[PDB]
Design a protein around this ligand. Sequence first.
Ligand SMILES: N[C@@H]1[C@@H](O)[C@H](OP(=O)(O)O)[C@@H](CO[C@]2(C(=O)O)C[C@@H](O[C@]3(C(=O)O)C[C@@H](O)[C@@H](O)[C@@H]([C@H](O)CO[C@]4(C(=O)O)C[C@@H](O)[C@@H](O)[C@@H]([C@H](O)CO)O4)O3)[C@@H](O)[C@@H]([C@H](O)CO)O2)O[C@H]1O
Lengths: 216, 216
Amino acid sequence: EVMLVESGGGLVQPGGSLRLSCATSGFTFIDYYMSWVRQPPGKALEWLGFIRNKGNGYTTEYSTSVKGRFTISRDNSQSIVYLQMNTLRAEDSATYYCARDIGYGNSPFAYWGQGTLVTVSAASITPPSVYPLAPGSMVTLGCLVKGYFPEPVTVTWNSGSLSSGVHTFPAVLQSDLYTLSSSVTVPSSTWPSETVTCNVAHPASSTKVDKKIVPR
Amino acid sequence: IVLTQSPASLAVSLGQRATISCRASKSVSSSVNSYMHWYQQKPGQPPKLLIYLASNLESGVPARFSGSGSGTDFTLNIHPVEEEDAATYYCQHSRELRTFGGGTKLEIKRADAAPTVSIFPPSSEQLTSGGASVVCFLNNFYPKDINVKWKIDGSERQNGVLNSWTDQDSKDSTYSMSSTLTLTKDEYERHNSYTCEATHKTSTSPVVKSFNRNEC
Ligand SMILES: N[C@@H]1[C@@H](O)[C@H](OP(=O)(O)O)[C@@H](CO[C@]2(C(=O)O)C[C@@H](O[C@]3(C(=O)O)C[C@@H](O)[C@@H](O)[C@@H]([C@H](O)CO[C@]4(C(=O)O)C[C@@H](O)[C@@H](O)[C@@H]([C@H](O)CO)O4)O3)[C@@H](O)[C@@H]([C@H](O)CO)O2)O[C@H]1O
């Protein structure tokens, strides 16, 4: 049924511009307002604006904070809504969401996209170095994911087969570079007997690395 | 028009009533309707609609969540709180300028849990790359109050320590922490014993984890 899928996010230099899209399916796109909402990391949600339905002529409304700087537009034949952002600054660094707003008798913001992270900085794009963390009843292994930019990375273990006993920690910034670690606890009766591998992805640099956790 | 949320942060034990206030700076009601929405947001997920038009439960959402109020004063009620309820909750004006309130973080209270500490020396591939990080994980503890001191050859090291907490765990209500001691290979190789000491209320003395580099 209803799906909103975003893309276009990533790194952009201060003063720069960017266009995020939001592809919809599973409803009659033209009869619905669409909204854009942003969330700086750690902070509250902020409504940015909407574009109206066919009934109201596809007209647009923006929050006081982004009027004249951001533009919402739509491709009705493809069911995409866009958000064009110009003159980006530090404070614009956030996760950006699209959401179905009003349409038919329906409540707005029932459906949301997964969001896309926009980062505004002078800093370059650096791939992560991915290191295995091996030890010295249950056993804790890890992966250190060091020296990357910008966020996000994603980490899975055994391509998704291991999910409980996992703690992926939020990244920390150290002088232009991010460092993140993931951790997995498994029963020692299965290690190293059955293998354990962390899968790290950095889309911002086409990196996809697997690290087998090998004993010392 | 601004929406103000009550405590901003709230702790409630399992099984009990959580009550989150939302106050609007101006009435958001008409004769017919009160235009208030309530959302739930977990880390790295989009917000989820819980309550529309002030008191109606969204389809799919469990019946422990309920809303109420009119005019300017509104309430979200969660009873009984479950472990999966650990999250941030936002109210929102669901028409006109669609303002979001600032959020209330809900913490699930539970019995104390001692941390499980694991220490990890630099990976030998990282040493091959010319870096060195000593990582130790402090897993599945409660309350969230914890600190890590590092000792290199007996003396405390304050600089270059990266700390990171998970958000409260959806299943067991604990917190996890990653403490990464960042170091030049130079200083790694010139010293021998590495120690991370966790201070937590579950113990009258630090939970200590150690290794010697020459013994590796
Ligand atoms: N008889 C009901 C009347 O009581 C309701 O309002 P009151 O609480 O008494 O003030 C009214 C509410 O209708 C809206 C609303 O919020 O105003 C809008 C509804 O959508 C339509 C509609 O009437 O069906 C159709 C949409 O395509 C639009 O044309 C809107 C409206 O004309 C314009 O809507 C906006 C806008 O800027 O485009 C966005 C709205 O969210 C709202 O901000 C309105 C302003 O109120 C100005 O009108 O502007 O009208 C529905 O969205 C409706 C909702 O389903 C209520 O739960 O809310 O509905 C009467 O039936």
